[PDB]
């Protein structure tokens, strides 16, 4: 439930400590945790909102010039002087102009020309700093079992750096503990929150401090004092005797195309919600019980309400209806071939499925992990057991290949933290994580200023180079290539 | 540009493709993609369904080019002569015909 | 401005062509509208600035 049709869900089957399992939660997908004697729990990261951000360095992307004025002096006089030069609201430019004997000033040198124009902004795109505080993640939990196809079965957990660990109380199943690392989630304190006009982005610090436009730091109020005062004003020169001042228009689509690779975000009220990120929680499943065990089996007839649908990952979802009234009772369900000898084949990724209500007709939804062959879903005890025919396509080799592909993509997206997905914890895992940290730091220092054009080019170049360099560096260049080009074709 | 009333149309994994009636209108921008669907969402099957979104397009600012043939170009040549003119009549443009 | 041909034809912006009669008809239209696909579930449309 909440994970079935997600198409980017991952199974964290396994718990070698009888306890906590590490799990990295992402905005895209969700995680189903299935332990030995514990109910399957579906966990998903839903929203991360940022609130009361401080304001830093608003930029001006649409300027406007108010009133121009100018001054000239004949060729051997001081310099052109405008009283508006000492005013810090005016852009002033000084140049040389042809003068003499026609302009009423008798000498034929070059004269000085000063033009000043008042500067007035508009729009003022603003960036804001995201501190580790004032940041909050929301995690939704659901529990497999008695739930109908459509609460005590679902929970919501708020995690902020002020309260990194929490417990979700699932009535009857106990409570699931989450000990989480909010501060090291997406490496904020390098990211600013940028708004232009009712559109908001997550943007890098360096990109925001390297953008050429009039700017002023701090919160705005009244008429600000704009800095640089150019890159929006152009002093063009006429036929060697005039100066004209123009402004460049609105600079907004230029910024929109400059912001390629920055994350969108949507703000409601003061709080702005991001739609992409990641977090890392450790799941203490030592107070998780099974609500169902110690229930007698149901002895009645079941019906198939809709069908046994197939999810994208191969698991079957079955929705059953119960006709008897035995109260809370176990659902006898299995995956079998050879109806003569009902030998359980496959795995049931559901609880010791139970019907909760005690009425005439109740409903149930359970999901199963069938074997790759043809099989039958067998529900019921004897002489009333409904069965459904079900066929699964893949093979174990294809499944292992797809698992390696998913792991590779997770690594490309999540750097070293990728090693914390099934992080139950040994010495091979920690060694792999350490050497991955080292190689990732080196790779981010050397490469990592490139964006799928630069990377594809330099990858093909290192490919050829390592192919023909004829030394022991062949392997080095081929591995650097493979890293780069896989990082690319992951997409 | 300026955008306007968006709309969308979605279909179950095993159906055709989504179609809005506003795709037969040359004033709307429409995009078709694949969306996770199934059972919970309300359609019973679990593949990728098809989603179409359309939005009305309007232009609030425009920009125009114009062709220049090498005829109907007029040049204005100004001519002056030395001799009797005094310094004042260097940058004076007046009834030069007289 | 005075502009060269082949700079005014290789421009990626929605273009009418010549005769403006009534409700204009912009030929391109995919150079100013961005369809961002949210997370699995939806689609959103924005315009560039």
């Amino acid at each position, epitope marked *: 439930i909440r994970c079935i049709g997600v198409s980017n869900r991952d199974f964290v089957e396994g718990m070698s400590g009888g306890t906590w399992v590490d799990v990295v939660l992402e905005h895209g997908g969700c995680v189903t945790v299935m332990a030995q004697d514990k109910p399957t729990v579906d966990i998903e990261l*839903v*929203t991360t909102t940022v609130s009361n951000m401080a304001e830093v360095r608003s930029y001006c992307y649409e300027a406007s010039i108010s009133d121009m004025a100018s001054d000239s002096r004949c060729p051997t006089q001081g310099e052109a002087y405008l009283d508006k030069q000492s005013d810090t609201q005016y852009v002033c430019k000084r140049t040389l102009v042809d003068r003499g004997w026609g302009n009423g000033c008798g000498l034929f040198g070059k004269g000085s020309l000063v033009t000043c124009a008042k500067f007035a902004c508009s729009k003022k795109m603003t960036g804001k700093s995201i501190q580790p505080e004032n940041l909050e993640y929301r995690i*939704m939990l659901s529990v497999h079992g008695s739930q*109908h*196809s*459509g609460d005590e079965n679902r929970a919501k957990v708020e995690i902020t750096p002020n309260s990194p660990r929490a417990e979700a109380t699932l009535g009857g199943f106990g409570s699931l503990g989450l000990d989480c690392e909010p501060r090291t989630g997406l490496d904020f304190s390098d990211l600013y929150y940028l708004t232009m006009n009712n559109k908001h982005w997550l943007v890098h610090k360096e990109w925001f401090h390297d953008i050429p436009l009039p700017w002023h730091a701090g919160a705005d109020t009244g008429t600000p004092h704009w800095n640089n005062k150019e890159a929006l004003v152009e002093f063009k020169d006429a036929h060697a005797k005039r100066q004209t001042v123009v402004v460049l228009g609105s600079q907004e689509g230029a910024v929109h195309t400059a912001l390629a690779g920055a994350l969108e975000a949507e703000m*409601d009220g003061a709080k702005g*919600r991001l739609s992409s990120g990641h977090l890392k929680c450790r799941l203490k499943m030592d107070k998780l019980r099974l609500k169902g065990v110690s229930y007698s089996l149901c002895t009645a007839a079941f019906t198939f*309400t*809709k069908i046994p649908a197939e999810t994208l990952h191969g698991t079957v979802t079955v929705e059953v*209806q119960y006709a008897g009234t035995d109260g809370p009772c176990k659902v006898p369900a299995q995956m079998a071939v050879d109806m003569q000898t009902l030998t359980p084949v496959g795995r049931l990724i559901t609880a010791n499925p139970v019907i909760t209500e005690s*009425t*005439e*007709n109740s*409903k149930m939804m359970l999901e199963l992990d069938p074997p790759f062959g043809d099989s039958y879903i067998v529900i019921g005890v004897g002489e009333k057991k409904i069965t459904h025919h079900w066929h699964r396509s893949g093979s174990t080799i294809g499944k292992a290949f797809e698992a390696t592909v998913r792991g590779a993509k997770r690594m490309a997206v999540l750097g070293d933290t990728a090693w914390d997905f099934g992080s139950v914890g040994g010495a091979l895992n920690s060694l792999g994580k350490g050497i991955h940290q080292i190689f990732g730091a080196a790779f981010k220092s050397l490469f990592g200023g490139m964006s799928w054009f630069s990377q594809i080019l330099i990858g093909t170049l290192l490919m050829w180079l390592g192919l023909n360099t004829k030394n022991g560096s062949i392997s080095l260049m081929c591995l650097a290539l493979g890293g780069v080009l896989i990082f690319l074709s992951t997409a | 540009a300026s955008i306007s009333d968006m*709309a*969308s*149309d*979605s*279909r*179950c994994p095993t*159906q055709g493709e*989504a179609y*809005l009636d506003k795709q037969s209108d040359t004033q709307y921008v429409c995009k078709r993609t694949l969306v996770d669907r199934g*059972w*919970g*969402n*309300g*359609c*019973g099957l679990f593949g990728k369904g098809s989603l179409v979104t359309c939005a009305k397009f309007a232009c609030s600012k425009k920009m125009t080019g114009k062709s220049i043939q090498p005829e109907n170009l007029e040049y204005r040549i100004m001519l002056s002569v030395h001799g009797s003119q005094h310094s004042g009549m260097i940058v004076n443009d007046t009834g030069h015909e007289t | 401005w005075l502009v060269h041909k082949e700079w005014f034809h290789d421009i990626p912006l929605p273009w009418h062509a010549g005769a403006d009669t009534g409700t204009p008809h912009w030929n391109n239209k995919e150079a100013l509208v961005e369809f961002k696909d*949210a*997370h699995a*579930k*939806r689609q959103t449309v924005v315009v560039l600035g």
Partner: antibody, heavy 127, light 108 residues
Framework: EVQLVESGAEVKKPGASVKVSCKAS????????MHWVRQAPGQRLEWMGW????????KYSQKFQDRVTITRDTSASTAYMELSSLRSEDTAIYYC?????????????????????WGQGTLVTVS | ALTQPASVSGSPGQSITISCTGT?????????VSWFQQHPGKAPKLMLY???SRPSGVSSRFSGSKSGNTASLTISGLQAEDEADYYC??????????FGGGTKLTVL
């Protein structure tokens, strides 16, 4: 428990505009979307539109696209529907119904049980 | 928008069926089919959602079925307190709601 209560009945001459509220109680108002359904006397029900009380997005039917405006007041837990340019056909009963909004805060897909709770109704008489 | 029979009558103690025919965009493609019961004076009450599924405090006599473009509500064991208006509703593919014409059930 869940209780949606609308304003009392109202009589308006044609050409005027009606504004009917729907106060919600017994649940978190910010996490639900309110639909407005009109029922003519002894006729079918007519869906007019909905408003997501969380962020404020709205969607109206094609039949009322340019005649109805739905707004909300979270602090007061109210949803208002205003219909302008009344006609004799608009003499009908107006109901408000809740529907759960997705956990991401968006209302793209409705939940299977859309109109689990309704309002008692409000008769608008166009004379 | 949804084709529903004008009226349906049945003697107390027998089953009866009310059909609801739609198109391939509202009832044909989606399990978004709901049945509402409305006694005169009161507001409609959700009797069935998700086609077959029904809420908690609803008698198990009401059943739902769907074939192609036609949904169907079945009332087995017609009781006294069943004379009301029954409306089928569906969430279309374009994101709008459509209701049925209406059926007045008479228990006689």
């Amino acid at each position: 428990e869940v209780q949606l209560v609308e304003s009392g009945a109202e009589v308006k001459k044609p050409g005027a505009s009606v504004k009917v509220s729907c106060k919600a109680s017994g649940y978190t108002f910010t996490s639900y979307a309110m639909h407005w359904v009109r029922q003519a006397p002894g006729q079918r029900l007519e869906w007019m539109g909905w408003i997501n009380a969380g962020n404020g997005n709205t969607k109206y039917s094609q039949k009322f696209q340019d005649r109805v405006t739905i707004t909300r007041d979270t602090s007061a837990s109210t949803a208002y529907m205003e219909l302008s340019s009344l006609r004799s056909e608009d003499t009908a009963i107006y109901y408000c119904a809740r529907d759960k909004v997705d956990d991401y805060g968006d209302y793209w897909f409705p939940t299977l049980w859309y109109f689990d709770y309704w309002g008692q109704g409000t008769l608008v008489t166009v004379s | 928008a949804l084709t529903q029979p004008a009226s349906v009558s049945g003697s107390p103690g027998q089953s009866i069926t009310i059909s609801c025919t739609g198109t391939s965009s509202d009832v044909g493609g989606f399990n978004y089919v709901s049945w509402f019961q409305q006694h005169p004076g009161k507001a409609p009450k959700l009797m069935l959602y998700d086609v077959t599924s029904r809420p908690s405090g609803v008698s198990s006599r009401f059943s739902g079925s769907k074939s192609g473009n036609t949904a169907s509500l079945t009332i087995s064991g017609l009781q006294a307190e069943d004379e009301a208006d029954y409306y089928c509703s569906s969430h279309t593919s374009r994101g709008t709601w459509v209701f049925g014409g209406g059926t007045k059930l008479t228990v006689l």
